[PDB]
Structure formats: structure tokens, C-alpha cells
């Protein structure tokens, strides 16, 4: 199945959760492809890709090359497709390229039909570009990543989520009166909430600095155990295709 | 002085800091206009604006109306210009309106030249739209908001910041060796880092739920004092 992950806003933990969930599914025996659809091109760094390695599916397209040559194998059952490094000129001029990347959709749709992977996870940016909407349309299921704070609370009342998305809380830690108030409120009111969450955990802060997914970095961390529970939930509930 | 504030990624605290810095500048005797340049239109909620109040400078501009009629008075020293509420369809089709907003730049240039306000603070989104670029061009100074984590660390090596921007840490907390390591590294290497920061602080989490700037909500909060230190530094260094 194709699974999109997209933060309700920036910085909520989408990329770290994508890399960790990919690692967990791979550990459960699944063949997994992870695709970074964010121009930040950060996902690769949870998989020990050198910062100076500029290649990626989008970089290859913009350079008139084959996006299939940009894949990297992390384990025998986990492959990675980085976005590629954009120059500063490209970063600040998205109108020069965000319409020229639509070939990735038929490429991924073919890859999906081949069945070489049980899971294709897509780290999606929090933008409304054409390529984000098109990649979202290829997803069988989707996770909308939040943190328990007033900003996310507002966003849930005013912005669209992908249809059929479930909501996954990250970075949670009890003790804050206002965050606990919001949390209890969501429990009684947010119908799309998943039955598990990811706690704040220094393993989730450290694993990126160690350039590893959280489950490889510290397998007995609470957040790694929670990501594993999410992986099992995906296998049970997100296995069907659109 | 026109001061732009822009997170190096989403969620770092840009909007809460913008509302708090405006309040502090007011407490120091200054006249301030705060402009929300983010389509999320969240800044207004720190100033007790009803969620269902949809007006704002962009909402007016798209509706064919005078954007200058969408400003709101918060105190005698502090005015607010919300972005306005976009419909779901507008939010998912930024190409339908991102070029229809370019009059705000000339409008804010007129306001700047009038000297009506001593400070104009602009809450800027982290997109690469031409309007974000042009609003940044009329800022005399800018703050790039970060949190001390591996994500912002990577970003500072690969993405452009507004020219001349200084870097402001928010959400500094206890309990993270990796944060402390990155922080000590920044102290020796990040040339544009500001000499003060803002901690994670329950008052910065609560003030948005109370719909107030942090310094109005809890004037003796540690984070309100940290923002006041920031406001004093801006007075001394960003006045030109």
C-alpha cells in the first residue's frame, strides 16, 4: 500500500516518523520504499546519506536524467528515494520546476503496480503544490501528523487534511496544563485520532544526529516501541488498496 | 523600522514571538503595527480576534476591497493587520491568488514612508513566493526563528536566510543532551546568532489559548522577560 505522511504544520515530526516507520515495517519482514517528496530533502539524512550527495528523484528529473537511478538501498528490504539537493536559485524559485515533476506520479504508479514493495511511504511537505496534491492522490492511506498545542488545535478547525487521513500525535509529554486540556479535548472530539501516539523521546531527537532511524538507533526506546505499534497497526488496518 | 520575523521551518514559534515582541515594544513606549503575511492567518488569534472574523489585508485585496480598512486597533499603541481567512479551495490553490496580492508591497511602502508607526513587524511564512520575497525586501531587519535541534541545524547549512538576518532561538528546554551539544556548537560557529534566547515556557503555550500576547497574559513570565530582553536589543540595534 502507498502511505502518505504529512504534518498539519512544519516541524511536527513527519520526516523522523516516516524514517522510523519504514525501519519498523522492514523489521517486520516488509519490503519498503521510502520517498522524500519534500524539497528540503531531509529524509535521506536519517539513512546515513552524505549531505554532499545531491542526487534524488527530483534532482534527476530537473537535470534531464532518470529518476530510477537515484534510488539507494539501505537494507535488503528498505530502499530510499531522496528528493535531491536544490540550489538556492531553485529553492527560492519554485515556479521554475514544481510543474516539471509530474512524471514522478506515473513512475510511482507503475512501481506500485509492480508489487516489488509491500509499502511505499511518502514524506510529504506542508504545501499545496501540484506535485504534492498529485502524490497525495496516489496514496492508499495517509497520516496527518500533529503535536498537542493550540496552533495545531486551530489548524484542525480551519485547514483540510487529506481525505480519510488519520491523525497521529507526536512529541507528546504530560505535565502541561494547556496541552493536557487540548489532549483530553481531542480524545472526546477528534474522530480521526489513532489509538496510539508517539511520546517526546530523546531517542527521536538524537537519531537524526546519529543519521539513523529511531528503531535502529535505540530499539528499546519508548518512541521506537510506539513506532513499532504503529507499524503493526498499519499492517492490520492500512493493507488494503484504493 | 520594519522588522520581518520568519521561521527557518514551520512551528518554531515565529507567530507567538511576533505578537509577544509587539506587546513588549509597546510596553517600552513604541507605536507598532503587526502584519500577518502568513495565509494561515494565525497572528490575529493572539490579539483576541474572533475566529469567525474573516477580514484581513489579503481577504480584502482578493475581494476587491481596500486592504487598509481591514486593520484593527488592539491598544492605543498597537494595531493589527490580519491576513484574512482563505476558503479551503483558496488554501489548496495558492496559484489562484499569490500574484493578486502584490499591491501589499506598495501599500506597506507607503505606510513605512509615512512614519505613522515606529515599528512594523511582519510575521512571514516559510514559502518562496514572490510576495514573501518582496515583503522581505522592505524589511530593514529580520529575525530567523529556530529551535535547537538537528533539523534546524541541517537547514542552516543548506537554505538561504534573509540577508542580514539574525538568528533567534525559541523553545530551549531542559533534558536534551543533543540540544545542548548543538547549542554549544552554534555558540562557536553561528556568527549571526543573537546573544539572548527564549525557553520553552508554559506561558508561551498558554497565551495563544488565552488569545493574548505572552507579556499581556503573564507580565512576570520568564518568557515575557526574555521577549523584553529581545525588545530592548531591537530598540538598540534595529532602530535604523
Amino acid at each position: 500500500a502507498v502511505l502518505g505522511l504529512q504534518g498539519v504544520r512544519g516541524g511536527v515530526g513527519t520526516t523522523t516518523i516516516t524514517a522510523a516507520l519504514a525501519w519498523s515495517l522492514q523489521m517486520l519482514g516488509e519490503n519498503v520504499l521510502v520517498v522524500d517528496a519534500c524539497p528540503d530533502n531531509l529524509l535521506r539524512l536519517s539513512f546515513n546519506v552524505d549531505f554532499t550527495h545531491r542526487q534524488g528523484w527530483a534532482r534527476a528529473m530537473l537535470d534531464g536524467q532518470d529518476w530510477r537511478d537515484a534510488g539507494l538501498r539501505y537494507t535488503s528490504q528498505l530502499d530510499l528515494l531522496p528528493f535531491g539537493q536544490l540550489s538556492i536559485e531553485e529553492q527560492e524559485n519554485p515556479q521554475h520546476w514544481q510543474t516539471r515533476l509530474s512524471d514522478i506520479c506515473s513512475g510511482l504508479q507503475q512501481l506500485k503496480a509492480s508489487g516489488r514493495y509491500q509499502w511505499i511511504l511518502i514524506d510529504l511537505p506542508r504545501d499545496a503544490s501540484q506535485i504534492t496534491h498529485q502524490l497525495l492522490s496516489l496514496c492508499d492511506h495517509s497520516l496527518a501528523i500533529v503535536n498537542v498545542d493550540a496552533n495545531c488545535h486551530i489548524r484542525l478547525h480551519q485547514q483540510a487534511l487529506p481525505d480519510g487521513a488519520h491523525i497521529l500525535i507526536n512529541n507528546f509529554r504530560i505535565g502541561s496544563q494547556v496541552q493536557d486540556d487540548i489532549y483530553q479535548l481531542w480524545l472526546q472530539s477528534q474522530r480521526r485520532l489513532l489509538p496510539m501516539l508517539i511520546h517526546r523521546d530523546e531517542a527521536m531527537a538524537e537519531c537524526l544526529a546519529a543519521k539513523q532511524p529511531v528503531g535502529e538507533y535505540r530499539s528499546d526506546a519508548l518512541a521506537a516501541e510506539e513506532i513499532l505499534t504503529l507499524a503493526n497497526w498499519c499492517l492490520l488496518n492500512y493493507s488494503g488498496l484504493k | 523600522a520594519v522588522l520581518g520575523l520568519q521561521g527557518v521551518r514551520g512551528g518554531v514559534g515565529t507567530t507567538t514571538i511576533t505578537a509577544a515582541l509587539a506587546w513588549s515594544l509597546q510596553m517600552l513606549g513604541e507605536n507598532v503595527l503587526v502584519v500577518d503575511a502568513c495565509p494561515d492567518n494565525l497572528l490575529r488569534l493572539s490579539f483576541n480576534v474572533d475566529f469567525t472574523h474573516r477580514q484581513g489585508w489579503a481577504r480584502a485585496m482578493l475581494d476587491g476591497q481596500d486592504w487598509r480598512d481591514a486593520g484593527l486597533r488592539y491598544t492605543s499603541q498597537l494595531d493589527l493587520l490580519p491576513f484574512g481567512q482563505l476558503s479551503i479551495e483558496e488554501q489548496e490553490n495558492p496559484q489562484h491568488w499569490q500574484t493578486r496580492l502584490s499591491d501589499i508591497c506598495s501599500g506597506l511602502q507607503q505606510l513605512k514612508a509615512s512614519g505613522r508607526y515606529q515599528w512594523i513587524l511582519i510575521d512571514l511564512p516559510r514559502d518562496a513566493s514572490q510576495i514573501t520575497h518582496q515583503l522581505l525586501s522592505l524589511c530593514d531587519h529580520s529575525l530567523a526563528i529556530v529551535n535547537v535541534d538537528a533539523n534546524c541545524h541541517i537547514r542552516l547549512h543548506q537554505q538561504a536566510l534573509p540577508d542580514g538576518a539574525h538568528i533567534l532561538i525559541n523553545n530551549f528546554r531542559i533534558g536534551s543532551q543533543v540540544q545542548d551539544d548543538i547549542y554549544q556548537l552554534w555558540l562557536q560557529s553561528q556568527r549571526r546568532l543573537l546573544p539572548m534566547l527564549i525557553h520553552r515556557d508554559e506561558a508561551m503555550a498558554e497565551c495563544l489559548a488565552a488569545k493574548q500576547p505572552v507579556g499581556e497574559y503573564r507580565s512576570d513570565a520568564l518568557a515575557a522577560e526574555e521577549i523584553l530582553t529581545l525588545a530592548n536589543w531591537c530598540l538598540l540595534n534595529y532602530s535604523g
Binding site: A144, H153, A160, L161, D181, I182, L185, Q188, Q190, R191 | -
Partner: peptide
């Protein structure tokens, strides 16, 4: 793309009275 499915129909009343932002969305 649609708005999240939110249903507002014991200690929630305390949180709603504590925080004007939360009271606003709840009614």
C-alpha cells in the same frame, strides 16, 4: 481534501472555561 471530522456534541467544562480559544471552537 476536507475539514477534520470534529464532534463537540466531565472535566472538559473546566478546560473550556480555562481557555477562551477552546471555548470558541466548542460552541
Amino acid at each position: 481534501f476536507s475539514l477534520p471530522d470534529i464532534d463537540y456534541a466531565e472535566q472538559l467544562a473546566a478546560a473550556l472555561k480555562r481557555w477562551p480559544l477552546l471555548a470558541e471552537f466548542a460552541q
